[PDB]
Scaffold this active site. Structure first.
Site, PDB file in Angstrom:
ATOM      1  N   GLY A 276      23.353 113.589  41.086  1.00  0.00           N
ATOM      2  CA  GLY A 276      24.803 114.181  40.295  1.00  0.00           C
ATOM      3  C   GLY A 276      26.156 114.171  41.528  1.00  0.00           C
ATOM      4  N   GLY A 277      26.269 115.334  41.370  1.00  0.00           N
ATOM      5  CA  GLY A 277      27.530 115.554  42.332  1.00  0.00           C
ATOM      6  C   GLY A 277      27.448 114.750  43.728  1.00  0.00           C
TER       7      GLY A 277
ATOM      8  N   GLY B 296      49.227  81.576  36.757  1.00  0.00           N
ATOM      9  CA  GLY B 296      48.949  83.165  37.452  1.00  0.00           C
ATOM     10  C   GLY B 296      48.201  83.301  38.044  1.00  0.00           C
ATOM     11  CB  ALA B 297      45.234  81.873  39.895  1.00  0.00           C
TER      12      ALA B 297
HETATM   13  C1  LIG Z   1      25.217 118.204  39.220  1.00  0.00           C
HETATM   14  C2  LIG Z   1      23.614 117.915  39.688  1.00  0.00           C
HETATM   15  C3  LIG Z   1      22.614 118.397  38.970  1.00  0.00           C
HETATM   16  O1  LIG Z   1      22.726 119.129  38.438  1.00  0.00           O
HETATM   17  S1  LIG Z   1      21.116 118.457  40.074  1.00  0.00           S
HETATM   18  C4  LIG Z   1      20.072 118.367  37.916  1.00  0.00           C
HETATM   19  C5  LIG Z   1      18.931 117.420  39.360  1.00  0.00           C
HETATM   20  N1  LIG Z   1      18.114 117.356  40.338  1.00  0.00           N
HETATM   21  C6  LIG Z   1      16.609 117.632  40.141  1.00  0.00           C
HETATM   22  O2  LIG Z   1      16.678 118.888  40.441  1.00  0.00           O
HETATM   23  C7  LIG Z   1      15.725 116.218  39.377  1.00  0.00           C
HETATM   24  C8  LIG Z   1      16.474 115.175  39.966  1.00  0.00           C
HETATM   25  N2  LIG Z   1      15.714 114.737  40.701  1.00  0.00           N
HETATM   26  C9  LIG Z   1      15.189 115.300  41.534  1.00  0.00           C
HETATM   27  O3  LIG Z   1      14.902 116.928  42.130  1.00  0.00           O
HETATM   28  C10 LIG Z   1      13.872 114.491  42.504  1.00  0.00           C
HETATM   29  O4  LIG Z   1      12.630 115.621  43.300  1.00  0.00           O
HETATM   30  C11 LIG Z   1      14.022 113.802  43.514  1.00  0.00           C
HETATM   31  C12 LIG Z   1      15.790 113.903  43.923  1.00  0.00           C
HETATM   32  C13 LIG Z   1      15.065 112.725  42.601  1.00  0.00           C
HETATM   33  C14 LIG Z   1      12.833 113.491  44.876  1.00  0.00           C
HETATM   34  O5  LIG Z   1      11.991 113.598  43.846  1.00  0.00           O
HETATM   35  P1  LIG Z   1      11.175 114.023  44.771  1.00  0.00           P
HETATM   36  O6  LIG Z   1      10.624 113.221  45.783  1.00  0.00           O
HETATM   37  O7  LIG Z   1       9.651 114.066  43.635  1.00  0.00           O
HETATM   38  O8  LIG Z   1      11.181 114.937  44.371  1.00  0.00           O
HETATM   39  P2  LIG Z   1      10.259 117.078  43.821  1.00  0.00           P
HETATM   40  O9  LIG Z   1      10.478 117.044  42.991  1.00  0.00           O
HETATM   41  O10 LIG Z   1       9.001 116.593  44.297  1.00  0.00           O
HETATM   42  O11 LIG Z   1      10.864 118.315  44.909  1.00  0.00           O
HETATM   43  C15 LIG Z   1      11.144 118.230  45.935  1.00  0.00           C
HETATM   44  C16 LIG Z   1      11.224 119.419  46.753  1.00  0.00           C
HETATM   45  O12 LIG Z   1      12.904 119.852  46.376  1.00  0.00           O
HETATM   46  C17 LIG Z   1      13.161 120.878  45.227  1.00  0.00           C
HETATM   47  N3  LIG Z   1      14.468 120.534  44.386  1.00  0.00           N
HETATM   48  C18 LIG Z   1      14.552 118.944  44.523  1.00  0.00           C
HETATM   49  N4  LIG Z   1      15.209 119.455  43.201  1.00  0.00           N
HETATM   50  C19 LIG Z   1      16.302 120.609  43.112  1.00  0.00           C
HETATM   51  C20 LIG Z   1      17.342 120.726  42.704  1.00  0.00           C
HETATM   52  N5  LIG Z   1      18.135 120.277  42.343  1.00  0.00           N
HETATM   53  N6  LIG Z   1      17.679 122.132  42.812  1.00  0.00           N
HETATM   54  C21 LIG Z   1      16.469 122.710  44.023  1.00  0.00           C
HETATM   55  N7  LIG Z   1      15.275 122.126  44.660  1.00  0.00           N
HETATM   56  C22 LIG Z   1      15.535 120.967  44.425  1.00  0.00           C
HETATM   57  C23 LIG Z   1      11.737 120.797  44.587  1.00  0.00           C
HETATM   58  O13 LIG Z   1      11.371 122.295  43.750  1.00  0.00           O
HETATM   59  C24 LIG Z   1      11.185 121.062  45.581  1.00  0.00           C
HETATM   60  O14 LIG Z   1      10.825 121.816  46.684  1.00  0.00           O
HETATM   61  P3  LIG Z   1       9.534 122.801  46.656  1.00  0.00           P
HETATM   62  O15 LIG Z   1       8.831 121.843  47.108  1.00  0.00           O
HETATM   63  O16 LIG Z   1       8.667 123.149  44.644  1.00  0.00           O
HETATM   64  O17 LIG Z   1       9.214 123.614  47.063  1.00  0.00           O
HETATM   65  C1  LIG Z   2      51.023  80.140  33.826  1.00  0.00           C
HETATM   66  C2  LIG Z   2      51.422  80.264  32.505  1.00  0.00           C
HETATM   67  C3  LIG Z   2      50.770  79.236  31.863  1.00  0.00           C
HETATM   68  O1  LIG Z   2      49.970  78.483  32.156  1.00  0.00           O
HETATM   69  S1  LIG Z   2      51.127  78.754  29.887  1.00  0.00           S
HETATM   70  C4  LIG Z   2      50.745  77.629  29.954  1.00  0.00           C
HETATM   71  C5  LIG Z   2      50.256  77.101  28.284  1.00  0.00           C
HETATM   72  N1  LIG Z   2      51.447  77.980  26.942  1.00  0.00           N
HETATM   73  C6  LIG Z   2      51.301  78.061  25.780  1.00  0.00           C
HETATM   74  O2  LIG Z   2      51.362  76.958  25.352  1.00  0.00           O
HETATM   75  C7  LIG Z   2      50.973  79.034  25.755  1.00  0.00           C
HETATM   76  C8  LIG Z   2      49.372  79.497  24.746  1.00  0.00           C
HETATM   77  N2  LIG Z   2      50.282  78.441  23.751  1.00  0.00           N
HETATM   78  C9  LIG Z   2      49.731  79.052  21.908  1.00  0.00           C
HETATM   79  O3  LIG Z   2      49.141  79.072  21.832  1.00  0.00           O
HETATM   80  C10 LIG Z   2      50.948  78.546  21.171  1.00  0.00           C
HETATM   81  O4  LIG Z   2      51.068  77.699  21.082  1.00  0.00           O
HETATM   82  C11 LIG Z   2      51.801  79.253  21.523  1.00  0.00           C
HETATM   83  C12 LIG Z   2      52.711  79.137  22.317  1.00  0.00           C
HETATM   84  C13 LIG Z   2      51.302  80.913  22.660  1.00  0.00           C
HETATM   85  C14 LIG Z   2      52.748  80.262  20.164  1.00  0.00           C
HETATM   86  O5  LIG Z   2      53.075  78.086  19.495  1.00  0.00           O
HETATM   87  P1  LIG Z   2      53.483  78.202  18.292  1.00  0.00           P
HETATM   88  O6  LIG Z   2      54.052  79.739  17.818  1.00  0.00           O
HETATM   89  O7  LIG Z   2      52.297  77.564  17.494  1.00  0.00           O
HETATM   90  O8  LIG Z   2      54.511  77.253  18.150  1.00  0.00           O
HETATM   91  P2  LIG Z   2      54.135  75.310  18.615  1.00  0.00           P
HETATM   92  O9  LIG Z   2      52.705  75.640  18.957  1.00  0.00           O
HETATM   93  O10 LIG Z   2      54.628  74.603  17.563  1.00  0.00           O
HETATM   94  O11 LIG Z   2      55.267  74.950  19.562  1.00  0.00           O
HETATM   95  C15 LIG Z   2      57.096  75.816  19.173  1.00  0.00           C
HETATM   96  C16 LIG Z   2      57.513  74.995  20.322  1.00  0.00           C
HETATM   97  O12 LIG Z   2      56.949  75.670  22.261  1.00  0.00           O
HETATM   98  C17 LIG Z   2      57.762  74.495  22.670  1.00  0.00           C
HETATM   99  N3  LIG Z   2      56.310  75.349  23.605  1.00  0.00           N
HETATM  100  C18 LIG Z   2      55.054  76.375  23.775  1.00  0.00           C
HETATM  101  N4  LIG Z   2      55.103  76.929  24.552  1.00  0.00           N
HETATM  102  C19 LIG Z   2      55.673  76.217  25.506  1.00  0.00           C
HETATM  103  C20 LIG Z   2      55.570  76.012  26.988  1.00  0.00           C
HETATM  104  N5  LIG Z   2      54.632  76.943  27.421  1.00  0.00           N
HETATM  105  N6  LIG Z   2      56.204  75.422  28.099  1.00  0.00           N
HETATM  106  C21 LIG Z   2      56.791  74.751  26.771  1.00  0.00           C
HETATM  107  N7  LIG Z   2      57.676  74.579  25.642  1.00  0.00           N
HETATM  108  C22 LIG Z   2      56.896  75.446  25.496  1.00  0.00           C
HETATM  109  C23 LIG Z   2      56.621  73.868  21.501  1.00  0.00           C
HETATM  110  O13 LIG Z   2      56.813  72.865  22.698  1.00  0.00           O
HETATM  111  C24 LIG Z   2      57.903  73.473  20.868  1.00  0.00           C
HETATM  112  O14 LIG Z   2      59.151  72.690  21.140  1.00  0.00           O
HETATM  113  P3  LIG Z   2      58.721  72.235  19.556  1.00  0.00           P
HETATM  114  O15 LIG Z   2      59.788  73.295  18.521  1.00  0.00           O
HETATM  115  O16 LIG Z   2      58.039  71.695  19.736  1.00  0.00           O
HETATM  116  O17 LIG Z   2      60.011  71.272  20.287  1.00  0.00           O
END
Ligand SMILES: CCC(=O)SCCNC(=O)CCNC(=O)[C@H](O)C(C)(C)COP(=O)(O)OP(=O)(O)OC[C@H]1O[C@@H](n2cnc3c(N)ncnc32)[C@H](O)[C@@H]1OP(=O)(O)O
Ligand SMILES: CCC(=O)SCCNC(=O)CCNC(=O)[C@H](O)C(C)(C)COP(=O)(O)OP(=O)(O)OC[C@H]1O[C@@H](n2cnc3c(N)ncnc32)[C@H](O)[C@@H]1OP(=O)(O)O
Ligand SMILES: CCC(=O)SCCNC(=O)CCNC(=O)[C@H](O)C(C)(C)COP(=O)(O)OP(=O)(O)OC[C@H]1O[C@@H](n2cnc3c(N)ncnc32)[C@H](O)[C@@H]1OP(=O)(O)O
Ligand SMILES: *C(=O)CCCC[C@@H]1SC[C@@H]2NC(=O)N[C@@H]21
Lengths: 70, 144, 64, 260, 406, 135, 135, 135, 69
Positions: free
Chosen positions: E50-51, E292-293
């Site tokens: 929980g919290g 871009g990387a």
């Molecule tokens: C926003 C936060 C919340 O709403 S808290 C809601 C969840 N809390 C819970 O009590 C249920 C979930 N987990 C547990 O309580 C389990 O006990 C966990 C933490 C997972 C561990 O299990 P395990 O080791 O078997 O413990 P157990 O259940 O036997 O309990 C041992 C003793 O601790 C107590 N305890 C445990 N949790 C709480 C709690 N939240 N509030 C108050 N007391 C808690 C048990 O009652 C037990 O004490 P006792 O042996 O009965 O004297």
């Molecule tokens: C870091 C950035 C990168 O690495 S970008 C690497 C990849 N670049 C791309 O081409 C973008 C992704 N490609 C696509 O999905 C599509 O082709 C995009 C460009 C988004 C849309 O193109 P679309 O509308 O289909 O047109 P088309 O393919 O017919 O191209 C039209 C004209 O645009 C140009 N163009 C396009 N993208 C680029 C580019 N990145 N660099 C340079 N020129 C580009 C084409 O060459 C074409 O020119 P033309 O009209 O054929 O003379």
């Protein structure tokens, strides 16, 4: 006289063994730790990097304190 | 000394130098298993997902043979009418150690399929070597 | 050993000279008998495996 | 040669390119510089900075211009050497202009390299030394060079009073090359082998009829005794570097540091 | 001063009322105030339920114990009631789950002593607060030039990069050679293994390393690596730790799963973190930096202070196979119409493009790379650059805070 | 110095000539001119064409003389070519050193609009006690 | 003052090479500097591919037009080659995908005029900068 | 993080449920909500009464099962007593975690009052370069 | 060595073999439950079960000798 001296608390060495001890300890002894020319250079000091609210008291007790402390 | 012909290529050309691929796991492989259809044949089928299975040296393209906690038949004398099989189906022979069918599996099988590896994961079985660990999880809640 | 498997045969004697392309061992794995073939002439030195023993991939069968 | 498709061959090619950066217009021009008794732009840096301290920036840069046939000659470094190193163990940023490449005239990439070491000095708060020797703007490149001059002057004004800026003048500075020195804090000239002037004797003769040598017009003595622009007039390049190291020994690295 | 929290707890004490939720709200609000002010470290050594989980998430580093600790908001029994998913508490909230899947844990200790040892290692790199100086160890700098001071361990870098651009290598072979004593404290070692991040020292100065790992996804960036590196960089930048980037990225990981999960929105996190960070930022480019990387991994105009590249670097818009298909589409159409040996033409054009442009020297010519260096120079260059950059002033427009893409 | 230091709104209108180092001084873009506009008659160049054509086309203009050509006319043709190509606002506009080329009558409108846009500026300079302007 | 980008796309101009990447890096660095200082709005009205997509992601609001704008880092054919899934540009990166699935879009306009109307509505609530009060 | 960091005016209106950690996340008072009001129907609790009663009364619910009693009817009786006791706005109002419990029609009045008074908040964080939001 | 040894601290939920049973390398010897997971221990060599020293429901330390040969 008020200097803190090295004490051989146990043993009674000969002057040769004293000399060996001293030459070892004296050459083991640390060099110029805390150096004499540690200049001041406040360029880019971390306190200037922080955002301060216009009314933040740390503008007195951190920023100004850190610039002006000498 | 075999000679392998290279076919005539299509007009398309390789436009990408490499593909990034996830590194193949070295030991524990974890798989998602669809439950059943024959999961009700067993006294406790959730041992399948509670067991760290170990892949035996018998695994090949017909199937991978595991060892682990034995699965217990509800009625160990019950015979199964043979039924279709598929790659990644997890059979449980009556000795209780599961077998995961590979690509060369027989078209029909004689043993109950306790689950089938999801198509998401079946291809990971293609890389598991003998001596690897396998864990299984139900891909969605098993309920009778 | 190119894979995990069982040494169904060890085919040579300790210290034995061997020729490239002879067989050192056979491993059952992949439901198949896999031969281990000597890659150079040499003397089979310290043959570390016993017949019917199971072994794990990458273990040295012998130095060469 | 080692195959360039291999890592060792690519490293051998880098070593080749680096070697070619020491004499980008051929050894014959370095021999001419030594025959004139002046140091090269690289030797000026290596003589000023402490030994081995020089780390060079943009060593392999080449100009981008295609005007008037410049694309046929792209010297490495684009005629300026830029980097950083130490003087007396304190870091400084430095540039040194190479009069052998297009007369040391400022081009686009030349200006970008100077701007880079200016911005590095302003960022890190370290003194900036400029060694100036260039025939003004590279006329073929046109107004781009004037935009780079403006960017350099603007960085000198930004750095003004922030970091110590020192200008060595060790050849003829013509045109725009004169203002960056004038914006720096100290100008050290060399008493017979450097000049500064805005426009040369031929234009002065055309406009006014005054007939004057470059030495009388803008020599180190003229800029000391008359214009008041130089702060020292060294007997030679070694004496100029000695004066610059003396100057730096008094100055702090920046206005937020104490003098040493 | 640093705050260490060791966390076990079954959430709110249910018999106490909403008071317990008020106290949770106050603890969370303090973790938010302290965020970026003091180092906050959370050890998880039991079930945090929980919290109890949200304070760890708000702290800077999360250390878990590999079988004895769990974190989960909603318990297995409620998950079973609401969804039918029958899950063990270890499968739900275990340390392996929070390392490999959720990305929440920063370390998974083999035991409690190992967790304490890792927490002390972490604390040894961090300053006590965002304004104190970092803890430098005393190291004596050897005299002479970078080329005069090459060790045999530096010279082992000159042969590291495989000749084929596509054969991977372990980036730790660079990291451990440029770091002092080979000492490297890896962070989130089990998560998003295609990027390696962690602390080291260079001449005693703490540094954060961020390095592409070619052995996973060929070094591609993805959603998980982008978030892993972005928060690490912003943690270093809070505490003034310089960052050194080792770049070997072919691009972003292609796939509809990345698109539908938001690679645009969550990849922009690493842009934001690197552009915002004002510490010293050094980039070493080893092989690829494409598209871009390249922008993401430490480009110059993203304010990298020093960029150096090895001779094997490859800085280009895209791989030559993809680039030729645009750049020569005219000639490839003409050759197709003429019925020429179009494949042989494509190979000739591709090898021409690779020889001409798929190299560091175009970016050096344009000043995006400050030097191309022998690989063995790298340690000396990085140390000398960090020594130059140890003080920076950078102007940023005044803002209340940024708006990093979440 | 004074122009590069000033942080008020700085607008530049270029009418006719803006040559060489005086372009740098008089309100160049990279000196931080916030808006630069030019009239069609602006002439932005490294130097006047009669000087540039003495330096470009060198050697070419001397082998013309060794071939006995009328270099006195050829140099005037080279001048006209240089002026028609380069001595205009458009090379600087192509480099973005001039933000707009405007009809002269537009000048009042552009200046008023620029000043109204620039009426608030943040510009950030390295920290200093004061500058060291040349005295 | 607010910055509106109307992004349309197609990525880097492949012939120009690495300079286009350096200019992307500079544009992103300015989007980060401006982040939290001035309102930034991105309208997507075409195939924003590659580098074109990170700038919108760094802006504060992204408005997409339903059937006629897309964003993706890497195209359907590289996705096909690596992952083997066939997908269209619309399925991969349409405004519906970036609303319902990726969460990157803030509005899906029925047309370009509706997108402009939504941008004017946003600006009616946002101040000009973080030092100003909302209208 | 975003809610705890924010220093603008923050108002919370609770309308039915605000359980568990989601109480903390959705604008709790100790997270620094400036005004918290709740409608009469609000239900503020550590967890829903089903889950709470099964835990709080573990003793009785085991004991009755060993007695073989009508444990289901006992659980319903305990759950009803818990819902009627603790699952209301009043325990949070008693703690002062809700500033007023209001007729729903008062909501716009209380909101407008708060927004009018808090347009400047004199509040601050510890100085930092930036936070370290979980990312 | 000939000892089959427990790889983990856990409880013996099932003993698969008896003394004098023949076994082959990779045959199952015991199953250990720990951390709510069940883990096989298998024969490393061909032989026959001797020195059998564990029983179902025994909780055993890591490195416990289960059997020999
Ligand atoms: C926003 C936060 C919340 O709403 S808290 C809601 C969840 N809390 C819970 O009590 C249920 C979930 N987990 C547990 O309580 C389990 O006990 C966990 C933490 C997972 C561990 O299990 P395990 O080791 O078997 O413990 P157990 O259940 O036997 O309990 C041992 C003793 O601790 C107590 N305890 C445990 N949790 C709480 C709690 N939240 N509030 C108050 N007391 C808690 C048990 O009652 C037990 O004490 P006792 O042996 O009965 O004297
Ligand atoms: C870091 C950035 C990168 O690495 S970008 C690497 C990849 N670049 C791309 O081409 C973008 C992704 N490609 C696509 O999905 C599509 O082709 C995009 C460009 C988004 C849309 O193109 P679309 O509308 O289909 O047109 P088309 O393919 O017919 O191209 C039209 C004209 O645009 C140009 N163009 C396009 N993208 C680029 C580019 N990145 N660099 C340079 N020129 C580009 C084409 O060459 C074409 O020119 P033309 O009209 O054929 O003379
Ligand atoms: C800013 C506004 C401007 O336009 S300022 C332009 C200033 N122009 C000049 O001063 C013209 C250059 N001529 C000079 O005499 C110079 O003053 C200098 C070089 C300083 C005098 O030095 P000096 O030792 O006499 O050398 P030199 O003139 O014989 O050198 C000739 C070589 O240098 C070159 N050069 C020179 N200036 C430029 C220039 N501005 N643009 C391009 N190239 C230039 C010449 O072309 C020649 O090189 P090359 O031998 O032709 O390869
Ligand atoms: C190797 O041991 C795996 C065998 C898998 C195929 C055989 S065929 C005959 C059995 N019937 C069946 O369905 N699988 C078994």
């Amino acid at each position: 006289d008020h200097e803190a001296h090295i004490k051989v608390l146990r043993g009674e060495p000969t002057p040769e063994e004293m000399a060996a001890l001293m030459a070892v300890l004296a050459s083991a002894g640390g060099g110029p730790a805390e150096p004499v020319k540690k200049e001041r250079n406040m360029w880019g000091h971390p306190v200037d990097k922080l955002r301060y609210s216009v009314f933040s008291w740390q503008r007195v007790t951190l920023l100004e304190r850190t610039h002006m402390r000498r | 000394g075999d000679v392998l012909p290279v076919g005539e290529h299509t007009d398309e050309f390789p436009e990408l130098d490499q593909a990034p691929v996830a590194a193949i796991a070295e030991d524990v492989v974890e798989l998602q298993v669809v439950p059943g259809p024959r999961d009700d044949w067993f006294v406790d089928p959730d041992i399948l997902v509670r067991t760290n299975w170990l892949v035996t040296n018998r695994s090949d393209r017909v199937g991978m043979r595991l060892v682990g906690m034995p699965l217990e038949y509800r009625n160990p004398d019950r015979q199964l009418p043979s039924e279709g099989a598929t790659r990644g189906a997890i059979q449980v022979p009556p000795n209780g150690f599961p077998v995961i069918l590979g690509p060369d599996h027989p078209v029909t099988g004689g043993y109950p399929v306790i689950g089938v590896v999801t198509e998401e994961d079946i291809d990971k079985l293609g890389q598991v070597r003998p001596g690897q660990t396998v864990r299984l999880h139900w891909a969605y809640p098993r309920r009778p | 050993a190119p894979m995990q498997g069982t040494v169904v045969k060890v085919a040579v004697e300790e210290g034995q000279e061997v020729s490239a392309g002879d067989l050192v061992v056979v491993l059952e794995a992949m439901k198949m008998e896999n031969p281990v073939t000597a890659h150079k002439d040499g003397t089979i030195t310290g043959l570390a495996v016993e017949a019917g023993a199971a072994i794990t991939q990458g273990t040295v069968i012998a130095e060469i | 040669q080692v195959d360039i498709h291999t890592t060792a061959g690519k490293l051998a090619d880098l070593k080749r390119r680096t070697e070619e950066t020491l004499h980008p217009v051929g050894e014959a021009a370095v021999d001419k510089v030594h025959a004139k008794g002046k140091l090269t732009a690289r030797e000026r840096i290596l003589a000023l900075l402490d030994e081995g301290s020089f780390v060079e920036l943009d060593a392999l840069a080449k100009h981008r211009s295609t005007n008037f046939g410049l694309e046929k000659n792209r010297p490495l470094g684009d005629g300026v050497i830029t980097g950083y190193g130490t003087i007396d163990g304190r870091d400084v940023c430095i540039f040194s202009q190479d009069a052998t490449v297009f007369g040391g005239s400022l081009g686009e990439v030349y200006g970008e390299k100077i701007v880079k070491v200016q911005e590095l000095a302003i960022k890190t708060g370290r003194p900036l030394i400029g060694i100036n020797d260039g025939a003004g703007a590279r006329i073929q490149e046109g107004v781009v060079s004037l935009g780079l001059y403006s960017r350099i002057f603007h960085n000198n004004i930004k750095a003004s009073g922030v970091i110590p800026q020192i200008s060595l003048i060790m050849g003829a500075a013509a045109g725009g090359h004169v203002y960056s020195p004038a914006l720096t804090d100290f100008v050290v000239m060399v008493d017979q082998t450097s000049q500064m002037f805005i426009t040369g004797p031929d234009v002065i003769k055309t406009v006014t009829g005054e007939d004057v040598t470059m030495e009388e017009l803008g020599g180190a003595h003229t800029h000391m005794a008359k214009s008041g622009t130089a702060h020292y007039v060294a007997s030679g390049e070694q004496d100029a570097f000695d004066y610059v190291r003396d100057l730096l020994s008094y100055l702090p690295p920046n206005n937020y540091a104490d003098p040493p | 001063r640093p705050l260490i929290g060791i966390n076990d707890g079954a959430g709110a004490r249910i018999q106490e009322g909403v008071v317990s939720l008020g106290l949770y709200s106050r603890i969370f609000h303090n973790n938010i105030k302290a965020s970026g002010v003091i180092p906050q470290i959370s050890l998880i050594m039991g079930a945090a339920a929980g919290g109890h989980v949200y304070s760890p998430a708000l702290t800077d580093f999360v250390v878990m114990v590999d079988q004895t600790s769990q974190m989960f908001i909603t318990g297995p029994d409620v998950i079973k009631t609401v969804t039918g998913e029958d899950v063990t508490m270890e499968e739900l909230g275990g340390a392996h789950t929070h390392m490999a899947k959720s990305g929440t844990a920063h370390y998974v200790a083999s035991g409690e002593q190992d967790a304490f040892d890792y927490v002390r290692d972490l604390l040894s790199y961090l300053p006590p607060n965002n304004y104190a100086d970092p803890p430098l160890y005393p190291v004596a700098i050897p005299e002479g030039s970078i080329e005069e001071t090459l060790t045999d361990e530096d010279l082992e870098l000159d042969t590291l990069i495989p000749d084929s651009p596509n054969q991977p290598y372990d980036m730790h072979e660079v990291i451990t050679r440029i770091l002092d004593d080979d000492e490297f404290l890896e962070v989130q070692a089990g998560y998003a293994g295609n990027i390696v991040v962690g602390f080291g020292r260079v001449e005693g100065r703490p540094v954060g390393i961020v390095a592409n790992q070619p052995t996973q996804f060929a070094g591609c960036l993805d959603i998980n690596a982008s978030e892993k590196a972005a928060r690490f960089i912003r943690t270093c930048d809070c505490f003034n730790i310089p960052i050194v980037l080792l770049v070997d990225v072919p691009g972003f990981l292609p796939g509809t799963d990345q698109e539908y999960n938001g690679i645009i929105r969550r990849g922009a996190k690493l842009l934001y973190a690197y552009g915002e960070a004002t510490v010293a930022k050094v980039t070493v480019i080893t092989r690829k930096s494409y598209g871009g990387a390249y922008c993401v991994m430490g480009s110059k105009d993203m304010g990298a202070d020093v960029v150096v590249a090895w001779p094997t670097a490859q800085i280009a818009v895209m791989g030559a196979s993809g680039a030729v298909g645009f750049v020569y589409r005219q000639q490839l159409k003409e050759a197709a119409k003429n019925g020429e040996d179009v494949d042989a033409l494509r190979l000739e054009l591709q090898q021409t493009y690779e020889d001409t442009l798929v190299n560091p020297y175009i970016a050096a010519e344009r000043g995006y790379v400050d030097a191309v260096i022998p690989p063995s120079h790298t340690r000396g260059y990085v140390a000398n650059a960090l020594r130059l950059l140890e003080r920076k002033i950078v102007q940023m427009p005044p803002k209340k805070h940024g708006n990093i893409p979440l």
